[PDB]
């Protein structure tokens, strides 16, 4: 069973997306669907659900009105259309499902409820005026200080980008041991920076080259940058 | 009629192997119909708990759920490093209604102090083209969270300039990490030698400081 959200980015205040849900694995007629959004650093808010198979729809108070959910059984896909949006609406939107029935009773017994085993990855809506800015990606050099078989540290900077979010990898996802890939910080400029480090053998370098490869998909940007002991 | 799930405590430290309750209470009935979740940082929730107490397949057995009256309560009987996350209670109670979740729980894994390690950087040729420099100092694998970076440039102590981030508990050792980003001018930084970072944590002895010279 999967399911798969697409549509998110950029878009200006008063501006309009549509995402889609993409569902895989499961009866999509007779589920319901729920769109759950999560403001950064914030909790978990419903904010509208579909029952494919009858077209009905519910909304949460703080979007009726300005967005519709909708459902298309013929390519098992779920969407919702958001209106007139608001710096409130940022956040990463996921789908997710009921299997139904939402609420069975057992005679003489009580109700048994579904829940929401099944989740999207989500994705992220920024709601905001400003404009996409592309990262530039510095080293972190190893020190020439790590001697005789210590451990060295060796990073890389990615700064002055906007929206969020930035990935990082090292060597192509083969590196992982020791990797540490920092949260975003927003710096007062208004554009978000954020670091990755990777800790390895003093004896290592020299003789093991180190790449960091940072996606910013807002802007199309993809940086392989190979960072080395400063000469 | 907005039903409101008050969930409690907000956040929370607990040992390896420690019992851990969970409670949302509930502003009206809503019969069993409350589901438990548990979200990694950037990661979908993940279901625990459906119909206020059955156990989803997959999910570990120290996990559990109860009901009385309004009141839920999800279990942890034995606590994991990897059980670090996010709870969440959700109701569901009003057929095509809405659905409400708590405020969430945060736990955090408690283990023993670990001191950090302790790396600082100098900033790049190809950065300084642009007009600015930043310095960064990386603290690797330490527990507890709290810890004092202290920046001084030529020996003078250095306020307003520099911004932190942390990174979310290891979901197998419990560690943090942490960077902190000291930005100056060029201009400025070309005026001073001795860059150092100085790092107080409850795991060292003493502080620990870090330095180069520019150049």
């Known amino acids: 069973v999967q399911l798969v959200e697409s549509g998110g980015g950029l878009v200006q205040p008063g501006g309009s997306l549509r995402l889609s849900c993409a569902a895989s694995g499961f009866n999509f007629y007779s589920s319901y669907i729920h769109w759950v959004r999560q403001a950064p650093g914030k909790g978990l808010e419903w904010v509208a659900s579909?029952?494919?198979?009858?077209?009905?729809?519910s909304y949460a108070d703080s979007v009726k009105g300005r967005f519709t959910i909708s459902a298309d059984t013929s390519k098992n896909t779920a969407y919702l259309q958001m209106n007139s949006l608001r710096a409130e609406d940022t956040a990463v939107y996921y789908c997710a499902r009921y299997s139904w029935p939402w609420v069975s009773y057992k005679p003489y017994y009580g109700l048994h409820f579904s829940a929401m085993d099944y989740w999207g990855q989500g994705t992220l809506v920024t709601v905001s005026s400003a404009s996409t800015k592309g990262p530039s990606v510095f080293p972190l050099a190893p020190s020439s200080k790590s001697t005789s078989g210590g451990t060295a540290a060796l990073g890389c900077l990615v700064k002055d980008y906007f929206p969020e979010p930035v990935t990082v990898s090292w060597n192509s996802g083969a590196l992982t041991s020791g990797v540490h890939t920092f949260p975003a910080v927003l710096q007062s400029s208004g554009l978000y920076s954020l670091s990755s480090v990777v800790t390895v053998p003093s004896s290592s370098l020299g003789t093991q080259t180190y790449i960091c490869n940072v996606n910013h998909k807002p802007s199309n940007t993809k940086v392989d940058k190979k960072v080395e002991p400063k000469s | 009629s907005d039903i409101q799930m008050t969930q409690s405590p907000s956040s929370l430290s607990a040992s390896v192997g420690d019992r851990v309750t969970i409670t949302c209470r509930a502003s009206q009935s809503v019969s069993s119909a409350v589901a438990w979740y548990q979200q990694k940082p950037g990661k979908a929730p993940k279901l625990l708990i459906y119909?206020?107490?059955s156990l989803y397949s997959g999910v570990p057995s120290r996990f559990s759920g109860s009901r009385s009256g309004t009141d839920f309560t999800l279990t942890i009987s034995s606590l994991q490093p990897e059980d670090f996350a996010t709870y969440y209670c959700?109701?569901?109670?009003?057929?095509?209604?809405?659905?409400?979740f708590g405020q969430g729980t945060k736990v955090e894994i408690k283990r023993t102090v670990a001191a950090p390690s302790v790396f600082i950087f100098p900033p790049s040729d190809s950065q300084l083209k642009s007009g600015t420099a930043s310095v960064v100092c990386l603290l690797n694998n330490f527990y507890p969270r709290e810890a004092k970076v202290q920046w001084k440039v030529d020996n003078a102590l250095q306020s307003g300039n520099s911004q932190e981030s942390v990174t979310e508990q290891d979901s197998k050792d419990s560690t943090y990490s942490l960077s902190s980003t000291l930005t100056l001018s060029k201009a400025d930084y070309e005026k001073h030698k001795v860059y150092a970072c100085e790092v107080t944590h409850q795991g060292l002895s003493s502080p620990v400081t870090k330095s180069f010279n520019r150049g």
């Open positions: 579909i029952s494919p198979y009858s077209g009905s729809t």
């Open positions: 959700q109701q569901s109670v009003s057929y095509m209604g809405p659905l409400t």
């Open positions: 119909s206020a107490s």
